[PDB]
Amino acid sequence: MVLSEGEWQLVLHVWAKVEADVAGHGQDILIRLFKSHPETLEKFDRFKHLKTEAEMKASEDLKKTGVTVLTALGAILKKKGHHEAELKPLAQSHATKHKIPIKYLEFISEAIIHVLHSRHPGNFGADAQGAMNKALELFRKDIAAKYKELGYQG
Numbered sequence: 659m660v661l662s663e664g665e666w667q668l669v670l671h672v673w674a675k676v677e678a679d680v681a682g683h684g685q686d687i688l689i690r691l692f693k694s695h696p697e698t699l700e701k702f703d704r705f706k707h708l709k710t711e712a713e714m715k716a717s718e719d720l721k722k723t724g725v726t727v728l729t730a731l732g733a734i735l736k737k738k739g740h741h742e743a744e745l746k747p748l749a750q751s752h753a754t755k756h757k758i759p760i761k762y763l764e765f766i767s768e769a770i771i772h773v774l775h776s777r778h779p780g781n782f783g784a785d786a787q788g789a790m791n792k793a794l795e796l797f798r799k800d801i802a803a804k805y806k807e808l809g810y811q812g
């Protein structure tokens with residue numbers, strides 16, 4: 659697929675707001691994911707044991723991971739499609755080391771869209787949510803293709 663420049667503009671415009679508070683958006687998105695699809699919290703050996711949202715909010719580890727995720731995703735979105743090199747290392751560790759199914763990446767894409775919408779309603783109308791969705795779908799289609807080349811396709 660190929661996003662038009664106007665769609666990338668809408669995606670990078672709302673992402674610039676996310677970047678004013680990366681750690682906070684990171685926390686929100688992961689808790690959103692773990693509350694919605696708790697089985698995903700099992701993939702994290704570091705803080706699998708967290709029982710409640712309050713515990714999750716107080717975990718420094720969870721907040722660092724959220725920043726690592728968002729920093730890596732933002733470097734991929736900024737490429738505007740030319741992300742081949744950033745994807746490789748990412749696909750290899752999630753398919754071989756952590757064993758993350760494509761399905762789970764759909765769940766987090768869903769959590770990212772939920773949070774942008776709640777935090778940024780003015781910059782996240784229907785056209786901007788459509789563009790973000792296109793950008794995340796593109797990301798998942800290329801990572802799934804790389805999983806396949808790596809022998810995992812989950």
Ligand code: HEM
Pocket residue numbers: 698699701702703704723726727728730731747748751752756758762763766
């Ligand atoms: C926007 C999607 C995602 C991005 C960009 C992302 C990015 C990253 C990055 C950069 C790291 C650190 C380096 C590495 O291990 O390769 C990481 C580690 C990890 N990721 Fe992801 N990830 C994504 C989705 C997920 C999902 C959906 C799961 C879980 C259901 C997952 C599970 C993990 C685990 C278990 C680790 C290790 C955590 C720790 O021990 O430090 N990731 N991820």
